[PDB]
Each structure stands twice: as C-alpha cells, then as structure tokens.
UniProtKB/Swiss-Prot annotation, chain A:
Task performed by this protein: The 26S proteasome is involved in the ATP-dependent degradation of ubiquitinated proteins. The regulatory (or ATPase) complex confers ATP dependency and substrate specificity to the 26S complex.
GO cellular component: nucleus; proteasome complex; proteasome regulatory particle, base subcomplex
Signal peptide bounds: none
The family this protein is said to belong to: Belongs to the AAA ATPase family.
GO terms assigned for molecular function: ATP binding; ATP hydrolysis activity; proteasome-activating activity; protein domain specific binding; ubiquitin protein ligase binding
Organism: Saccharomyces cerevisiae (strain ATCC 204508 / S288c) (Baker's yeast)
UniProt protein name: 26S proteasome subunit RPT4
Superkingdom of the organism of origin: Eukaryota
Keyword field: Acetylation, ATP-binding, Nucleotide-binding, Proteasome
GO BP terms: ERAD pathway; nucleotide-excision repair; positive regulation of RNA polymerase II transcription preinitiation complex assembly; positive regulation of transcription elongation by RNA polymerase II; proteasome regulatory particle assembly; proteasome-mediated ubiquitin-dependent protein catabolic process
Gene name, Swiss-Prot/TrEMBL: RPT4
Keyword Repeat carried by entry: no
Swiss-Prot record, chain B:
Taxonomy, superkingdom: Eukaryota
Subunit structure comment from the entry: Interacts with UBR1 and CIC1.
Protein name: 26S proteasome regulatory subunit 7 homolog
Post-translational modification: The N-terminus is blocked.
Protein role: The 26S proteasome is involved in the ATP-dependent degradation of ubiquitinated proteins. The regulatory (or ATPase) complex confers ATP dependency and substrate specificity to the 26S complex.
Subcellular location: Cytoplasm; Nucleus
Similarity comment: family membership: Belongs to the AAA ATPase family.
Gene name tied to this protein: RPT1
Whole sequence portion shown: 95 to 187 of 467
Organism: Saccharomyces cerevisiae (strain ATCC 204508 / S288c)
Swiss-Prot record, chain C:
PTM comment: N-acetylated by NAT1.
Name of the protein in its database record: 26S proteasome regulatory subunit 6A
Similarity comment: family membership: Belongs to the AAA ATPase family.
Species of the source: Saccharomyces cerevisiae (strain ATCC 204508 / S288c)
Subcellular location: Cytoplasm; Nucleus
Purpose: The 26S proteasome is involved in the ATP-dependent degradation of ubiquitinated proteins. The regulatory (or ATPase) complex confers ATP dependency and substrate specificity to the 26S complex.
UniProtKB/Swiss-Prot annotation, chain E:
Residues holding Zn(2+): 87, 89, 100
Name of the protein in its database record: Ubiquitin carboxyl-terminal hydrolase RPN11
Regions crossing the membrane: none
Miscellaneous comment as given in the Swiss-Prot or TrEMBL entry: Present with 16400 molecules/cell in log phase SD medium.
Modification note: N-acetylated by NAT3.
Chain location of the short sequence motif JAMM motif per the record: 87-100
All copies of domain MPN, residue ranges: 5-131
Lineage: Eukaryota, Fungi, Dikarya, Ascomycota, Saccharomycotina
C-alpha cells in the first residue's frame, strides 16, 4: 500500500531520466558510423554533367552531377563537397579560401549605438544618410537612376572618436563590422594577395549588408617613396587590385568599403577620384556645445552624487574628444577609491579634469 | 635502438592494437593522458619506442 | 492497490531492458576507439 | 581532437597537451620578485600600484562607480 | 591449387553493396555453403557480421553473433556449414597481409578447408569487378 507508492513514483522518475541519456549514446554511435567526404573547388564548369575541379584534397579531377544538384551555381573557387569514392557533387557550400576568423575579425552589430556617442553629431548625421540609406534602401538610388554610393573615408587621428563613428554606423544597420589588417593582405606568394581581397568582396555580398573596414591605406596603398621599385611593387599590386574592382564591371552595392588614414593628402589621387571614394568625411575637434553633449552622456552612465557639477567640467574643457572625457571619469575614480566612496563626487571631478588638461594642450 | 620516427605499416586491431608513434609533421600520433602500463610494449614491427620527442609513453626499449 | 502492484513489476523489468540496450552501445564505442 | 584514420569522423575532442603558443613570446609564470630589489623608487611605486593594482583588486569599486577601468 | 569456387548471385550482390559503403573501414562476414567432394566449393548464402570503425580483425570475430543468425536461419530451412570468410581490403587482390595469412590459418582448421574472399571495391567502378 503505502510502501508500494513510495517505490512506484521514484522508479517512474528514474526510468525516464536514464532513458534520455541512453538514446543519446545510441544516436552517437549512428552518427560515428558515417564515412568522410572530400572537399574541392570547381575550377570551371565544363558542361552540365562534367565539371573540372582542382581538389582541395588531391590532384585535378573530372567529376559529375549526382542527384538534384545545383548545376548553374558552381563557379571559380566556390568550396564544394564531393564524395570519397563516387566523386560526384554531394553539396555546394559558400565560397571560402581564406580563414574568416583572423584575417577577418568580426563584430556583429556595433559596440555602441549611433546616438550614445552624441556630441560628434554632425559627423553622425552625414555618415548616417550616405551609408545606412543605400544598404537599407538600394531601391531609391535604382529608381532615380543614380549609382548607390561607393566608398567612404574616415580621416583624422585615431581615437578622436574615430573608432566610435566606424563601429556605430554598423550597429544601426545591423551590419557586420569586419576589421581587416592591411599588412596581412601582404602574403609573399602568387595570387595570395589577389585571393584575399576578392574573398572579402565575395563574402560582403553573401553575408550582406556588411562594412568591410580596411584600416590604413599606406601599407597597401599610399603614394610611397616615389612609386619606384625597392619592394614598393608589393604595395603597388595591392592598390592596383582595389582600383580595378571599383572602376571596372564589378561594383560596390551591399559591400561598403571604408578607408582610414591618419591624414587624407597621403592617398593616391585615383583613390581621391569619385568612383572610388565619393564620400570624404573629416573628423575635427568638437564644439563647446559638442563637448557638452558628449560629457553629459559619458557621466550619466557612471553613478554620481547630486552635488556633481556638469557645468564646471565643460567650462574647463577645450579641444576634448570622446577619449579625453572618458579619461576625466576614470582619473576621478582613482580619487574616488582614495576618498573611500562608491561613486563619483565634485571633489574627485575637479582634480581629474585639471590633470587631463595639464598633460595636453 | 635509434628511432626518430617509427612506422608499423597497418598492423591493425580494434580497442587499440596499433600502438604506433610517428613523430613527423605529417602524422601526429599521441598516446597521451598519462599511463599505459606495459611490460615491454607499444606495438611490434621491430620498432617499439617513442621517437626523439615523447607523446607521453614512458620509455620501453 | 492492484493497480499499483501490477505497474510496479513491469517498471522493474523495463530498467533491465534499458540496461542491455546501453550495454550494447558501450561495446560499440570500444571497437571504434 | 581525436579523428579516426580509416573512418574520417570526429570521435572525441581533447584538451591541448602539446599545442603551440607561436613560439617567439617568452613566458615566466608568476616569478617571485619583490619591491625590495630596489629602494628609493617610492614615488614611482605608488603611481604604478594605482595604475594597475588597485583597479585589479577593487574591480568591484570601479563597477560601483560605473566607470571604465584602464587595461594598459 | 585449382578449385572452382561457385558464387551464388545473392552472395555477390550483397558483398558488392556492403563493401562499397563499408570502405574505408574494413568489413567482414561469413560465407555459407558446402564442400562437395574436391574440385568444388559451392557458396549458397553470405551474411554480414558487424563493422568496427578502424577495421575488422581476428580479435573482432564474435562467435555469438554468427551463431544466433544461423539458428534463426535454420527455421526457414537454411541449413549450411561455414565454408569461409569475406573481407574488404583495398589494394589487395593478388597479395595478402601477414595478419590476413595468420587469420586464414585459424579459420581453416575449424572448417574442413576455407576460402578467404577479398573483394576490392575501387576497381569495381571502372567497368570491371575485382574479387
């Protein structure tokens, strides 16, 4: 009776719990009995039933159609799945020929939104209507009959809120921000250099919308020593590639490319033509009004006492970028651990503001 | 007994019974995670040993 | 009273049925490793 | 990772036992070294402790303030 | 030396099908039939034994499996002796392994005599069958 119930429930609970575990191990063995399957790239499509492949596992092969295969989508250098013995097309994958994870470092959205960095507002405004609108609405530019925009340039010192503006345009679109190190685009092998640029452009269209952000265009571009030969042909090959895709039959539509350069005068005049870079944004030192809006935002997200004075800090600050406001918060905070608190106070604030002023102009 | 790479050319069984150390860039064979207690033995083939660099395997023969 | 008793023997049996089933899988994994 | 050699399927993942660090960086894990090799550097010691050490310990205090902490 | 070993259609079909999916990990099973005098080995049926994910071995033969299939076979009315064994082995067709020689030597003492059937599935797609 009483005895029988106490076992019955407990035994009912046990059998289910064991059962889920045992089936998982049995599904596992099934998954393992499966056999490998070699990857290649289609070199070019020979017919509708014969294809030429450069294997990514072997020598050169003629391979054929299997069943219900995509027969008009196999193009140069797309990665494909081939059978181990059958040697027919098992699947098509997206094109890949270079890692996507270190030669391309990905930041899905942006670190901050585009109205939380506010006091860079003019630059926010004119990045927003050039970059966001053709990505979201390619249709308005098609309907007018003008070209969607091509390239956009950020220039000025890095961290004037330069980095902010680039991260921030991407967030609002929900683009992926893709940081490319320009030197790594410097492989010393045949066509590696060709390969890398192309693959970013191909990936930009697959994973669309996307920002391809190319940092420094004086390790793959620039005006060089005089543009002779000293090892200035590696640099010349890299720039030539950028120029050929832009000017040519290829184009930029849901691939936006963004150039970054310490000072804009250092860039080849081909890059300075429209049809490479149409948009050229400058990043100056903010306004007093501009400083004011950025400080109120910055100090807001930091907890502080009612007796804090925004008015005093803004008055002391002239020639301050977003970075300089951020330093005043952290500097005060050293004095605030020191004064044995858990919040930032006018006493911490004044000292901090004067020190950050002193160290610079 | 010099060996600095030790094939045994598909002696096959199996858990285990291949017990072959190759130290060569092409083919990395690790018999790791501490002890296998053996009297003399990895596997057969004139070449029980653990190359010039040891993927565990505490020094038979 | 009856309902509880009859259920309870079948539940004891089903634990054994699983115990074979998992025993077999474990054997399989050993050949594969 | 443990991949079968005649079946081409991933049986298991392992931890690292021998994997590269990209040998060209030099490693000294927690060398025992004191502030008593050199005296007389007091003011600089004080500066350095506030720059890195005090945030590291009072991560919490910087979280309560709500402030960004220095990584370099 | 000379023996006409007679392969049943069904044995053949099931061996080529299995052996082609089973590679690159070796697969084995048991051949059923009869010896008739000498000069003649008749193979009547063949059934699969299990796979092992790094290749079948003498250590992997399992007498309980082979047994449970035959006993169940019998009540259809399939009553045969074991006459040998099949193995896939890529790159074997005129050669044998030293493991495979030793393996055959254990097997033929149990039977009266025994065939090692080695099927190669690579050149079984080239407009020829190798066995």
């Amino acid at each position: 009776h009483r005895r029988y119930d106490d076992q019955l429930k407990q035994r009912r609970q046990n059998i289910r719990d064991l059962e889920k575990l045992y089936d998982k191990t049995e599904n596992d063995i099934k998954a393992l009995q499966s056999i490998g399957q070699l990857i290649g790239e289609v070199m070019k499509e020979l017919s509708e039933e014969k294809y030429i492949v450069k294997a990514s596992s072997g020598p050169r092969y003629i391979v054929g159609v299997r069943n219900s295969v995509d027969r008009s989508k196999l193009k140069k250098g797309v990665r494909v799945t081939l059978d181990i013995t059958t040697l027919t097309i098992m699947r098509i994958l997206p094109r890949e020929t270079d890692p996507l994870v270190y030669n391309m470092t990905s930041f899905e959205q942006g670190e901050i939104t585009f109205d939380g960095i506010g006091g860079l507002t003019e630059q926010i405004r004119e990045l927003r209507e050039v970059i966001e609108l053709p990505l979201k609405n390619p249709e308005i530019f098609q309907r007018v009959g003008i070209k969607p925009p091509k390239g956009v340039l950020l220039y000025g010192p890095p961290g004037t809120g330069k980095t902010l503006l680039a991260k921030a345009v991407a967030a609002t679109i929900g683009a992926n921000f893709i940081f490319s190190p320009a030197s790594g685009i410097v492989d010393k092998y045949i066509g590696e250099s060709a390969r890398i640029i192309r693959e970013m452009f191909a990936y930009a269209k697959e994973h669309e919308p996307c920002i391809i952000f190319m940092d420094e265009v004086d390790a793959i571009g620039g005006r060089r020593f005089s543009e002779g030969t000293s090892a200035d042909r590696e640099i010349q090959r890299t720039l030539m590639e950028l120029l050929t895709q832009m000017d040519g039959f290829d184009n930029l539509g849901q691939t936006k490319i963004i150039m970054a350069t310490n000072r804009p005068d250092t860039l080849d005049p081909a890059l300075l033509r429209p049809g490479r870079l149409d948009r050229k944004v400058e990043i100056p030192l903010p306004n007093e009004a501009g400083r004011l809006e950025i400080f109120k935002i910055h100090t807001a997200k930091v907890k502080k006492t009612g007796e804090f004075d925004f008015e005093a800090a803004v008055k002391m600050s002239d020639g301050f970028n977003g970075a300089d406001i951020r330093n005043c918060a952290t500097e005060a905070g050293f004095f605030a651990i020191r004064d044995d608190r858990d919040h930032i106070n006018p006493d911490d604030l004044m000292k901090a503001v004067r020190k950050v002023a002193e160290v610079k102009k | 007994h010099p060996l600095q790479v030790a094939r045994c050319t598909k002696i096959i069984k199996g858990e285990d019974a291949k017990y072959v150390i190759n130290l060569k860039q092409i083919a990395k064979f690790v018999v790791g995670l501490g002890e296998r207690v053996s009297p003399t033995d990895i596997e057969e083939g004139m070449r029980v040993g653990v190359d010039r660099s040891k993927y565990n395997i505490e020094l038979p023969l | 009273i009856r309902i509880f008793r009859s259920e309870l023997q079948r539940l004891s049996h089903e634990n054994n049925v699983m115990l074979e089933k998992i025993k077999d899988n474990k054997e399989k994994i050993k050949n594969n490793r | 990772v443990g991949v079968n050699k005649d079946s081409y399927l991933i049986l298991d993942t392992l931890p690292s036992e021998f994997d590269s660090r990209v040998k060209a960086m030099e490693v000294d894990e927690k060398p025992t070294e004191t502030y008593s090799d050199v005296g007389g550097l007091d003011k600089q010691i004080e500066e350095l402790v506030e720059a890195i050490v005090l945030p590291m310990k009072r991560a919490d205090k910087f979280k309560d303030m709500g402030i960004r902490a220095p990584k370099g | 030396t000379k023996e006409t070993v007679y392969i049943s259609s069904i044995a053949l079909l099931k061996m080529l099908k299995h052996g082609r999916a089973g590679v690159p990990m070796e697969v084995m099973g048991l051949m059923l039939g009869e010896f008739v005098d000498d000069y003649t080995v008749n193979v009547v049926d063949v059934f699969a034994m299990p796979q092992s994910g790094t290749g079948v071995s003498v250590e992997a033969v399992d007498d309980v499996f082979q047994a449970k299939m035959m006993d169940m076979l019998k009540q259809t009315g399939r009553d045969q002796m074991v006459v040998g064994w099949y193995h896939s082995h890529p790159g074997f067709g005129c050669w044998l392994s030293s493991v495979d020689v030793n393996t055959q030597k254990s097997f033929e003492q149990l039977n009266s005599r025994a065939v090692a059937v080695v099927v190669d599935p690579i050149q079984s797609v080239k407009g020829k069958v190798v066995i």
